[PDB]
Amino acid sequence: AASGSALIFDEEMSRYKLLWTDPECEIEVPERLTVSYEALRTHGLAQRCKAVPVRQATEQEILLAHSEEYLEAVKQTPGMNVEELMAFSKKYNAVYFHQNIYHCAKLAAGATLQLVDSVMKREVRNGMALVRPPGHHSQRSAANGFCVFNNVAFAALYAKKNYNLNRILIVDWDVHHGQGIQYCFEEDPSVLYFSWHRYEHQSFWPNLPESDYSSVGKGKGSGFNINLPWNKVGMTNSDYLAAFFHVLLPVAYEFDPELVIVSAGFDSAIGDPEGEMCALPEIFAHLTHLLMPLAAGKMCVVLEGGYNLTSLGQSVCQTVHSLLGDPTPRISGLGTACDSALESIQNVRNVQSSYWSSFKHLAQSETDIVWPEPLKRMPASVRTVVVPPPGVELTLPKNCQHSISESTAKEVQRIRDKHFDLTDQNILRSLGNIISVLDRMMRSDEVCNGCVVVSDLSVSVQCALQHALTEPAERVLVVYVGDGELPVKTNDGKVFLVQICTKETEDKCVNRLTLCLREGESLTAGFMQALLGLILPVAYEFNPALVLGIVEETLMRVWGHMTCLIQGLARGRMLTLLQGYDKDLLELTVSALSGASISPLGPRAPKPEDVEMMEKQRQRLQERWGLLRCTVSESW
Ligand SMILES: CN(CCCCC(=O)NO)CC(=O)Nc1ccccc1
Ligand SMILES: [K+]
Ligand SMILES: [K+]
Ligand code: NA
Ligand SMILES: [Zn+2]
C-alpha cells in the first residue's frame, strides 16, 4: 500500500505580482508561497515530503474546464505591456494579470495534476500543492478573484477522465465561495462539492444569490452541491467542527468518495484580513484528520487563498503535519456553535434532507491580531506498542513494536495486595503490560498509543483507568463495546464513558453516552451516524488527555474508522484493551492505531429506531455538551 506525502512547489509561481495600485488585489502577493514553503522547511516538514516536480498543464488539459476563447485571450497576456494588462484585467472582477501569470497559471494547474497522478498511482498516500494563482473562483470563460484557471476543477475532471472515477469529494474550506467549482459540477452527481464561506446575507464578495444554502445542484446533480454560508464574522473552532460533524462528514462518509480534493484556503484562519474569522491554525490539523479515513486516505490538498503571512505559515504546517500522520494538537475551549452558525447549519441540513440519509429524519414528523503560536507536533519514535497473548508472534507495520521493569512489577504487587485475592499470574502480566504501555505513552513522545490483549476486563479496566488518572491525565474518555457495567465512575468531571451495547439501558447522567443499536444489516450506517453526530462532538468538547478503548469478547467493520477518528483527541494517545484473542480485530486495531490507511466502507440508510434513539441522546446531552447542537436553541 502507498506511503509518504507529496509536496509540490516551485519558486517560479512566485514570479508574478500586481503592477498597479489596486487595494482590492494588493493582498495577493508572491510572499504567500515563499512564507508557506519556508515555514514548512523551518519545521522540518518539507524534508519529510516527496518533492514532486511542477509541470505545465497542456492545452488539452486546460480545455477540460475552460473555453477555447478564454484560453486564447489569456494566451495573449505574456505579450502585453502594463497598460494592456490593466485594460485586460478590468474585464474581470477582482483579478490582475502580469506578463508571467499565464505561465504560472499553467504551472499551478500542472502542479495539481502532478499531485493527482502521484496519489492515484499510489506513489504517495496523499499530498499538498502550494500554487499561485489560486483557482476556485475561475470559470469556463472568466478570470475571477485572483484566479485564472480552476486548479481543483481540473484535478477532478482529470481524475474522472484518466482514472475512471465515479465519486470525487471536493472540500472548499477557503473563506470565499468557490463559485467556479460550483458552476463546473452543478449538474454532475459524480463530484460532490462542499463549501463554507463568509456570506453575510449576500453582502460579502462575490455577492451571489447562488452561494446560499439553497443551491443544492441542478438536475441529476441535485444534492451534490452543499453551500454553508457564514452570516457573521468571528467564526470559531466550534463553528468549524459543528459544520464538519453535522453537515460535511455525514454526507462525505455516505457519499464514499474515491478521491478527496481540498480547496485549502487559509483565509478562514484567525488574523486573516479577508475572512475575519477566529479559528486557530490548529483546527486545520483536525479538518485534515477527519477527512483522511475517506477514499483510503487519498487526499490532494491544493492551496487557494490565505493572506496573513503568519497564520498562513502556521496553518499550512498544521495541514502537512496531519498528512504526514503526526499527532493532532488538543483543541481546548470547544462548545456550542454560535446562533448564526447554528441557523446556517440547520438551514442547509433541512434543504439537503431530501437527498441525504443522515438528514432524512428531519423531513417527516416521526423525526494587529495576536494568538498563541502553535506547539510543536512530534511523531513518536515508535508509534504503536502491541502486547498480544504470550507467544503469539505477528507481523507488525514498521512503526509498531512489542511490549516489564522492576519499578513496574513492584507496582502490580502493591496494587494486587490492596485491591485484588487475585493470583492468576497471567492477569498479573497483563496489568504489568498496561502500566508499562501507559508509562511509555504519557511519560514521553517515544510511544503514542498501544493495544493490549487481556483476559479479565474488570481488573484490567480498573488498573488502566486508575493508573492513567494519576499519571496525571486530567480527563479520560472511555469507549466501551460490550454490555454490563465497568469499574468506571463518572461522578466527577474526569471521565466520560461512551458505551456501545446490545441492551437498552437507561442513561441517567450527562457524563455517559449509551448507544443501544438494533442488531442487523443496518448496524454499520447507524454506528457511523452515531460516531460523527454524537461521539465525536462530545469527545471533542470533553478534550480528554487519554482515550481508553475496551472491547469485550462477546460484528464491527467500523472499528478502524473509530480508532482513526478518535485519534483526533488526546494527541492520539489511545490505549485499547481487547478481551480475548481475535487475530483480525487485533490486526485491524494495530493498523489503525499506527496510522495506516483505512479501508472504505462502501454502501446507505439506518433504522428509524436507531435514528430516534440517537436524537433522544442528542436531546438529553446537548444542553451540557453544546457541540452536539445542530439547530438553534429555543429561547424561553
Ligand atoms: C479579496 N477580493 C476577492 C477575494 C478572492 C480572494 C480569495 O481568497 N478567494 O478564495 C474581494 C475584495 O473586494 N477585497 C477588498 C476590496 C477593497 C479593499 C479591501 C479588500
Ligand atoms: K469555501
Ligand atoms: K456537484
Ligand atoms: Na477591477
Ligand atoms: Zn479565499
Q: List the bound ligands.
A: 5-[(2-anilino-2-oxoethyl)(methyl)amino]-N-hydroxypentanamide, potassium ion, sodium ion, zinc ion
Let me know the number of strands.
Answer: 16
Main sheet overview: 8 strands, parallel
Span of the ends, CA to CA: 56 Å
- Give the CA-based shape: globular
Strand content is: 5-15%
* Largest sheet: spatial strand order: 2-1-3-8-7-4-5-6
Derived structural class: alpha/beta
Helix content: 25-40%
Number of structural domains: 2
Q: Using the CA coordinates, give the radius of gyration.
A: 25 Å
Q: What count of helical segments does DSSP give?
A: 19
Organism: Danio rerio
Protein name: Polyamine deacetylase HDAC10
Catalytic activity: N(8)-acetylspermidine + H2O = spermidine + acetate; N-acetylputrescine + H2O = putrescine + acetate; N-acetylcadaverine + H2O = cadaverine + acetate
Binding site for substrate: 22, 94, 307
Protein architecture, described:
This protein has 636 residues and is an alpha/beta fold. The protein folds into 2 domains: 1-367, no CATH class; 379-629, no CATH class. It contains 19 helices and 16 strands. The chain has helices spanning 31-42, 59-62, 68-75, 82-89, 101-120, 151-163, 179-185, 237-255, 283-291, 309-323, 339-352, 357-360, 406-419, 427-443, 457-469, 523-542, 559-565, 583-593, 608-621, and strands at 5-8, 50-51, 126-129, 168-172, 191-198, 225-230, 259-264, 299-303, 382-387, 400-402, 447-454, 476-481, 495-501, 512-516, 546-551, 574-579. The strands form 2 sheets. An 8-stranded parallel beta sheet has the order 2-1-3-8-7-4-5-6, with helices on both faces. An 8-stranded parallel beta sheet has the order 10-9-11-16-15-12-13-14, sandwiched between helices. Helix 17 links the parallel strand 15 (546-551) and strand 16 (574-579). Helix 9 packs parallel to helix 10 (309-323). It starts with a strand and ends in a 15-residue tail after the last helix. Residues 174-176, 265, 267, 304-305 line the site of zinc ion (ZN). One potassium ion (K) binds next to strand 5.
